[PDB]
């Protein structure tokens, strides 16, 4: 069973950075062989929220956020938090680096 | 006095096409020597709406829109209506062609 | 076995509408119980291109495009062509309507 | 004479945040009665670059950037540096705050 990544992308300007970060993370995760679920947030709201079970099963959590989100749900997980710009422009490296991220 | 252009940009996805079309139109109008006022319509709302006096004084109206907007206000003006994609990727030509656009 | 949908999203402004349409189609196809493969075309290039076998096995082809793409590879399939804006904002209905789309 | 503001906007994801922040700053500066010049930096390159004279005459420099830019040209000026997201969503306060920003 391929390891699982979960991610949240959140930019409170329109929808573009939220969705670009999500889709680039999804494409790069799959290229590297991982399963991926992404929750997205904008200024209006939240779509496809991570479930408790999804977070439980994940090897890593990647947060590509330009606003504060709830992070208590990720306690005990390795969490790699970056801006949406970095997630969009450095996606390959961010996926790889997330597996060495500190436990939150 | 330089001739005046008024424009509306309107895309019902987030804010990016609305603002990219607006800024590209503004930059190209100024490059060609024209005065420009742009009303924008996106997910944050309608901003900087054209006034009746601005429309009265304009030489042309450019509509870069992917949704319906109020158009009765442009009766009697030359109106050049295009998609946001065309306004963004063909900005120089759209400015030039607007002066030959049909009277609405 | 779930029926299969294939899609191409293609907006020639950056990558935002291409990726937003792709994610909206992916999530909504899955919600309706379908298997889904989306090829994307944007400024970054073409990604996750449909294979000949994927097109062969699909029940329908959804083209969410704001530019012409060669449709020869979809001959003999039902093809539902819509703008990226409509695919992003009307996704549930577009997936349902695609099964009644004309054969190309 | 109205006091002068100069700004640079620079988000290295396409052109959207660069242009949205530029238009927000331009419109809000004008609303507050200031003269405003904005240089933009995006995937298309640098547009409407500030001149030495414009920087000399400015009361404040606002940098709405999501990457490092060379700041030597702003020495001796009050410089207020914020992200593009904050410039877009908090424009009124950022313009007012810039006049108390530290001299660079
Ligand atoms: Cl957007």
UniProtKB/TrEMBL annotation, chains A, B, C, D:
Subcellular location: Cell inner membrane
Domain PTS EIIB type-2: 5-100
Descriptive protein name: protein-N(pi)-phosphohistidine--D-fructose phosphotransferase
Protein's organism: Borreliella burgdorferi (strain ATCC 35210 / DSM 4680 / CIP 102532 / B31)
Shown residues within the full chain: 162 to 265 of 625
């Amino acid at each position: 069973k391929a390891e699982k990544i979960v991610a949240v992308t959140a930019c409170p300007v329109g929808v573009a950075h939220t969705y670009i970060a999500a889709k680039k993370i999804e494409n790069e995760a799959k290229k590297q062989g991982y399963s991926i679920r992404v929750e997205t947030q904008g200024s209006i709201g939240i779509e496809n929220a991570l479930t408790e079970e999804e977070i439980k099963n994940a090897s890593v959590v990647i947060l590509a956020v330009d606003k504060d989100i709830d992070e208590k749900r990720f306690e005990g997980k390795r969490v790699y938090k970056v801006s949406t710009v970095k997630a969009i422009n450095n996606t390959e490296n961010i996926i790889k680096e997330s597996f060495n991220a500190p436990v939150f």
